Design a protein around this ligand. Sequence first.
Ligand SMILES: CC(C)(C)NC(=O)[C@@H]1C[C@@H]2CCCC[C@@H]2CN1C[C@@H](O)[C@H](Cc1ccccc1)NC(=O)[C@H](CC(N)=O)NC(=O)c1ccc2ccccc2n1
Ligand SMILES: [Cl-]
Ligand SMILES: [Cl-]
Ligand SMILES: [Cl-]
Ligand code: NA
Ligand code: NA
Lengths: 99, 99
Amino acid sequence: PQITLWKRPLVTIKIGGQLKEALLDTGADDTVIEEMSLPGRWKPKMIGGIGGFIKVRQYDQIIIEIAGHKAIGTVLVGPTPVNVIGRNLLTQIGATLNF
Amino acid sequence: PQITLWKRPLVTIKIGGQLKEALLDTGADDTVIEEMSLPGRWKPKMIGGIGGFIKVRQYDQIIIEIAGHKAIGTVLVGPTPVNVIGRNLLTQIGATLNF
Ligand SMILES: CC(C)(C)NC(=O)[C@@H]1C[C@@H]2CCCC[C@@H]2CN1C[C@@H](O)[C@H](Cc1ccccc1)NC(=O)[C@H](CC(N)=O)NC(=O)c1ccc2ccccc2n1
Ligand SMILES: [Cl-]
Ligand SMILES: [Cl-]
Ligand SMILES: [Cl-]
Ligand code: NA
Ligand code: NA
């Protein structure tokens, strides 16, 4: 699709058999999702956003569908008011910004 | 242009007479620029994201040239580590996400 930006670019994602809404975010290096169980071990990570840094749980090689496109990659889990799909997975679904 | 997302989507902007680099950020509602003076009236605002909130100055009707394309709108000025071009101005240059 071609998504305009008059509204937030929110799409459905599927992770763990569950549907969630998430933001397609060209400004995010990483993908950050609300607290949720994921399989396997996690590693520590600090990420910085507009208000400061937070600690998150880094899970690698997680299967996630994004707007019907399959990705398998790193998902950070931590406190965020919005689930964010960052460039690590936007590249896997072939997303570009155009004007 | 078509901008791939392997790297941060940084472009040159001109604002307040000044050339700067900024991030094309589909996950930002607002345009947030590093501390600088702008002409006219402003009012305080709090904006948030991961990590919490910051206090900003809101200037309305500010012109910014973004990768050669003029846009006008509200620009927030405050303690951001990165200049962010958010949706309020990305719409004005006709930017879309495509996959
Ligand atoms: C996700 C993460 C990997 C941590 N990356 C980032 O956060 C980088 C950090 C960079 C340096 C600091 C300044 C911002 C830039 C760009 N951001 C990406 C950037 O796209 C970031 C992603 C985001 C969206 C929504 C909610 C939280 C987080 N957007 C934002 O921070 C913008 C700022 C704004 N305009 O007010 N926030 C929002 O647009 C926004 C939307 C809904 C909300 C609901 C409740 C609470 C807060 C909400 N904030
Ligand atoms: Cl990844
Ligand atoms: Cl505006
Ligand atoms: Cl349009
Ligand atoms: Na894993
Ligand atoms: Na003004």
